Amino acid sequence: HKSEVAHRFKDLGEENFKALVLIAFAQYLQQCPFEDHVKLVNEVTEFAKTCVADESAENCDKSLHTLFGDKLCTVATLRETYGEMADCCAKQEPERNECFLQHKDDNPNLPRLVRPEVDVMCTAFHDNEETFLKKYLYEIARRHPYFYAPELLFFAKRYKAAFTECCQAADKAACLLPKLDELRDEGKASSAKQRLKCASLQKFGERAFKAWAVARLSQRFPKAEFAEVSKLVTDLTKVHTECCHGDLLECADDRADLAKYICENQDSISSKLKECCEKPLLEKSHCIAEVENDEMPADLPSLAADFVESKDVCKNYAEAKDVFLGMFLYEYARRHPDYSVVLLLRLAKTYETTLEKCCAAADPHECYAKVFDEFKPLVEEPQNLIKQNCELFEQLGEYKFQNALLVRYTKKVPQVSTPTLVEVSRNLGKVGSKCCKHPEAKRMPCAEDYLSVVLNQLCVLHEKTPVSDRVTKCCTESLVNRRPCFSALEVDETYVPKEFNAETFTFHADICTLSEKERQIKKQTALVELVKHKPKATKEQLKAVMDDFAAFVEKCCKADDKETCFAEEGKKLVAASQAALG
Ligand SMILES: CC(=O)C[C@@H](c1ccccc1)c1c(O)c2ccccc2oc1=O
Ligand SMILES: CCCCCCCCCCCCCC(=O)O
Ligand SMILES: CCCCCCCCCCCCCC(=O)O
Ligand SMILES: CCCCCCCCCCCCCC(=O)O
Ligand SMILES: CCCCCCCCCCCCCC(=O)O
Ligand SMILES: CCCCCCCCCCCCCC(=O)O
Ligand SMILES: CCCCCCCCCCCCCC(=O)O
Incomplete structure (x- = not known):
């Protein structure tokens, strides 16, 4: 239509419009006070109502970027408050917006x-x-x-x-x-x-992204043809590149179009999209991104047909390597919504390496005849970690499970900051209480999802304050080896134990008055420090010191005179504990 603003206002609604405009300005003019933004929102909202009334009214024909850019340049304290950013207002629109993104701190x-x-x-x-x-x-x-x-x-x-x-x-x-x-x-x-x-x-x-997307969308939409999934992976790739660059408008439109596209071809993609495709503009894409996996055809061929046996696998592969590998992923993922995306990537990777080191051999069909036997150990590694860890979490509780991880990781990377270890082990524990409650078929996708943020954050904190090469190794590894790398860490034989510190292991009634959260963190902190002081202690030895601690707490957090108790019974515990830990 003629008025972009009027259009957005119409199919968005005044309420959502005002909130979005607000979020948009707060994202660029991050230093301005609330009352200044509210004012701008009203002025832009007033402008919008005008264009709704008269599509041909003044400025109504200007694009949102242009309009948004002009309002931004209106702020008089722009140069003083934002310095360099003010210089953006001196450029022609196409670059003015480009200039603003670069300063969005x-x-x-x-x-x-x-x-x-x-x-x-x-x-x-x-x-x-x-x-x-x-x-x-x-x-x-x-x-x-x-x-x-x-x-x-x-x-x-x-x-x-x-x-x-x-x-x-x-x-x-x-x-x-x-x-x-x-x-x-x-x-x-x-x-x-x-x-x-x-x-x-x-x-x-881009290649790794599309790979991730093919696998993910194939589990989600197992009934869609591979040409359909490819279509979507392409559009999703463009969508995210644009959304990552930070340009809200482009980003929103690509997402809108995609949502529209999917809904129109809904019956050719998934059956679980009815709901989402009904919902209002502002929610379609969000709903869609989160939709549940559709049900996979029960009448599905054996992969080995087109991928292992079929003579001339190389002919099809050499003809277009990525497409062929993509089809392999599609076929493999839609049959395994229970696998994590990275596992599916690992299989496809393994397969690629095999086709490369086999299609250039005498009798190809026999070189890669095995292959599917390569996968078994790749698939089992993550499954075993899930069962083994979910069982432990079932016995002990979240809390005691966190303490177990705490001991386990402090011994692997003692060099890490105690508070870092405590947080990481805690979040890791939550992943356990969140995912173990699901049936096996949804466990791996669940773990992967939560573990990815946790691992990422872990890495980020380490990017800034490096402490271990091994951690850096894992963190800079390929996305597909990230978690297996961390799982592969072993006890640090190197580490020289921190010598004893009276302070670190002293306690007052503070812990009696503190709430669960702060109390656990106080206990968990002591534990990390314990392990760092004597990393060669046993699950058995430590378990004893821990129990003697649970008692020690109770004894004192209940006794008439708490203070003294924590000092006298404190001397004891420590003295005794050291003896036991040699
Ligand atoms: C967040 C997701 O798991 C789904 C996501 C997505 C992202 C990258 C590669 C594959 C899948 C996703 C979207 O961002 C999205 C945006 C607009 C319209 C539909 C969408 O569907 C998705 O699945
Ligand atoms: C998410 C945007 C909606 C605004 C409503 C937020 C109101 C809750 C205020 C608490 C924020 C502090 C963050 C926290 O610790 O939870
Ligand atoms: C003057 C510019 C203000 C206009 C605000 C941008 C409009 C955002 C549209 C969001 C539509 C939802 C799209 C989606 O993610 O599915
Ligand atoms: C059009 C379909 C594109 C999909 C390409 C398939 C690529 C599969 C190889 C596995 C990628 C592992 C990730 C990586 O190491 O970069
Ligand atoms: C399940 C929560 C307990 C914490 C232990 C995590 C073990 C799960 C590891 C599997 C992660 C799936 C991702 C992958 O394939 O690498
Ligand atoms: C603060 C540095 C400590 C980092 C601890 C490593 C985190 C391990 C994540 C992998 C979880 C799967 C369980 C495992 O294999 O150990
Ligand atoms: C070297 C001797 C110092 C003694 C170390 C005692 C610290 C143990 C803290 C572990 C907390 C127990 C966990 C719990 O059940 O809350």
Whole structure:
């Protein structure tokens, strides 16, 4: 149509429009106060209503980039507050927008947002539901310039729902705090996954991305023809390149088109897309990205037909290596929604290496006749880790399971920071309590998903403050070897134990008054330090020292005079404990 703004306003709605415009400005003008953004939002919203009334009104024919760019350049404190960024306003539109992305600071030095008390939140919520949520939408959007805006809006609505419900509860906190903790983690995970997929697309390149996409979409849409999946992998690749670059508008349109495309060809892709394809513009793509795997045809041939036996596998492969490998992935993935994507990538990798070191042999058909026997050990490695770890988690509880990981990883990389080990082991523990509750068929995809963020974050923290070559080795390995690399780490025979420190192992009644979370972290911290001090201790030896500790705590956190107890019974525990640990 003639007016881009009018169009977006129409099929978006005033409410969503105002929220998005807000998120958009907060993502570029990250240093401006809330009240300034609110003002801009009103001016842009007013402008929009105008174009809705008269498609031909002034400026209404200008593109969103142009309009958005002009408003941005309106801010008078631009040069003083943003310096260099102000120089962007001197360029012709095509480059002006390009210039703004380059200055969108991915990580500003804003204060960590603190969670106020439930009572204060709920009261603010009730006094002014809108400015309360917009204020935070603003605080979140400015701290996360790259988070896809629409999704950030999607989260805002879940936050609103949690307040509406919880602030009306007998006991507010019991209802809200957890919903909020769940919202945060999920938000951080969605965030980490977007940065991950973008880093990946940057480091490893387009081929690795498409490979990942083929495998993932084939498990998701096992009934779609391979030509259809290829189509989608192509569009998804363009979509993410554009979304990673940070240009919100281009990004949103490509996603919109794709969502539209999928829905129109819905019956030719999956049966579980009805719901999603009904939903409103703003949610189609998000819904689709998260849709459940469709059901795979029960009448499916044996892979070995076209991939192992069939003479002339090389003829088809040499004719177009990637396509052939792609079909292999497609065929293999849609039959295995229970495999993790990386495992599927590992198989395809293995197969590629084999076709390369076989198609250039006397009797090819016999060189690669095995192949499928190559996969068995690749498939089993991840499955065994899942059963073995989920069983342990079943016996012990999340907490005790975290302590087990704690001991296990401190011994593998003692060089790592204690607080880093504690966090990593804790998040690793959550992955266990989250995924082990699923039936085997969904366990691996689940672990992969959560483990990818956890490992990524682990690596990032290590990128900054390097400590182990082995960690760096794993972290810089190919995406397909990342987790197997970490699983392959063994006890550090090198490590020289930190000599004893009286402080580190001293305790006061503070732990009696502290809440579970802080108490566990206090205990878990001591544990890492314990292992670092005597890394040659046994599950058995440590287990004894740990038990004598559980008691020691109880004994003192209950005794009339707690203070003394922790000092006298403290001297003892430590003295005795050292004796036992030689
Ligand atoms: C996040 C996902 O697992 C699904 C995702 C995707 C990303 C890269 C390669 C394959 C699959 C995904 C989307 O981003 C998406 C965007 C717009 C429309 C449909 C989409 O579907 C997806 O599956
Ligand atoms: C996600 C955008 C919607 C804005 C609503 C957020 C309101 C919750 C405020 C708490 C934020 C502090 C983060 C946390 O620790 O949970
Ligand atoms: C002046 C510019 C303000 C316009 C705001 C950008 C509009 C975003 C459209 C989002 C549509 C959802 C697309 C999707 O992800 O499926
Ligand atoms: C058109 C289909 C494109 C898919 C290409 C198949 C590539 C499979 C090889 C496995 C990739 C492992 C990732 C990597 O090491 O880069
Ligand atoms: C399952 C949670 C417990 C923590 C142990 C994780 C073990 C799962 C490893 C398998 C990861 C699948 C990804 C891959 O194929 O490398
Ligand atoms: C802080 C550095 C410690 C890093 C600990 C390594 C994390 C291991 C992740 C792999 C989980 C699968 C279980 C395993 O094979 O050990
Ligand atoms: C070298 C002697 C110092 C003694 C070390 C004791 C510290 C053990 C902390 C482990 C916490 C037990 C875990 C728990 O059940 O909460």
